[PDB]
């Protein structure tokens, strides 16, 4: 059986969540996609889903993927963004889900988008465990003093409501999929400006894994048939 790392998510469980009363039993969009894709392969793939994370906060997804390079995981299934530092250590599938960063802010915010958020003095929120932190630092040179990690949609909402004046944020940078789920439950907030990154979600396997190439064909089969959108819509639908 393959040891498949799964992120032990504390928020936005629609993507992946551990089943109550179990360590190794998971449900969600990412798990349905995987299950769908494996069923199109010419060979059996017996798995053990191993939770990665402390159960209190969403894990570092980069660190989850690194456990492939150490041989602790045979691969990783979840909402894993196919970003460059990750692609240098493991082999991702074709993307099964479109993603990328947006700016989330209050209705009347003076922020026009990422460029305006940039030159500001104020805190920016990001999601616990996300690449979004290194992107803000490496790509936009935002001071670490300004970057606030936020673990839950409830923490997102409190931080935006409070604002910089009360130990909150002026805005949150997070990938569109989580943000759509957030705004669905928190209709006071908006995306400001354009999606300014475009990395999708992939399944991660060891470099030169045949399973990453076989699963890519299977994912292209799900997308071409409309099933990928069907799976997306059954888990994700102001
Ligand atoms: N999809 C995010 C992880 C989200 C989270 O922080 O839980 C990533 O690939 O980095
Ligand atoms: Na499921
Ligand atoms: Na094989």
Task: Please report the atom of ligand 1 found closest to the CA of residue 177.
Answer: 1
Q: Which residue has the tokens 């396997």?
A: 205
CA of 31 to the centre of ligand 3 (A): 20
- Could you give the CA distance from residue 212 to residue 74 in angstroms, rounded to a whole number? 11
Helix runs in 72-208, H state only = 84-87, 114-119, 132-140, 153-162, 176-185
Residue 97's Cα: distance from chain center in Å? 10
Closest alpha carbon to 115 in 91, 94, 141, 146: 141
Ligand number, closest to the Cα atom of 17: 2
Determine the Cα–Cα distance for residues 93 and 78; give it in Å rounded to an integer.
12
Please give the number of the atom of ligand 1 that sits closest to the Cα of 78: 1
* Residue 136: count of CB within 10 angstroms of its CB: 23
Residues 6+ apart with CB under 8 A from 78: 6, 7, 9, 15, 16, 30, 61, 64
- CA dist 75 and 24 (Å) reads 15
Tell me the structure's resolution in angstroms, rounded to a single decimal: 2.0
Report CA(211)–ligand 3 centroid distance (Å). 7
- Say how many Å lie between the CA of residue 45 and the centre of ligand 3: 8
Residue identifier of the C-alpha nearest atom 4 of ligand 1: 130
d(CA 197, CA 170): 20
């Amino acid at each position: 059986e393959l040891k498949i790392g799964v992120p032990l998510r504390v928020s936005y469980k629609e993507f992946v969540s551990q089943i109550r009363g179990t360590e190794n039993m998971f449900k969600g969009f990412c798990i349905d996609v995987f299950t769908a894709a494996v069923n199109l392969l010419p060979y059996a793939v017996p798995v053990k889903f191993i939770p990665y994370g402390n159960g209190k906060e969403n894990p570092s997804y980069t660190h989850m993927v690194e456990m492939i390079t150490t041989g602790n995981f045979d691969g990783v299934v979840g909402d894993v963004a196919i970003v460059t530092n990750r692609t240098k250590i493991v082999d991702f599938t074709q993307p099964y889900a479109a993603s990328g960063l947006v700016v989330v802010a209050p209705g009347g915010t003076p922020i026009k988008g990422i460029e305006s958020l940039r030159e500001r003095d104020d805190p920016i929120g990001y999601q616990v465990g996300s690449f979004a932190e290194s992107y803000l630092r490496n790509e936009l040179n935002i001071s670490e003093s300004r970057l606030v990690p936020l673990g839950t949609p409830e923490a997102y909402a409190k931080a935006l409501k409070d604002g910089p004046s009360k130990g909150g944020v002026a805005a949150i940078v997070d990938e569109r999929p989580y943000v759509e789920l957030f705004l669905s439950s928190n209709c006071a907030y908006r995306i400001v400006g354009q999606e300014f990154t475009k990395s999708g979600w992939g399944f991660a396997f060891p470099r030169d894994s045949p399973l990453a190439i076989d699963l890519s064909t299977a994912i292209l089969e799900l997308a071409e048939n409309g099933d990928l959108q069907r799976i997306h819509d059954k888990w994700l639908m102001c």
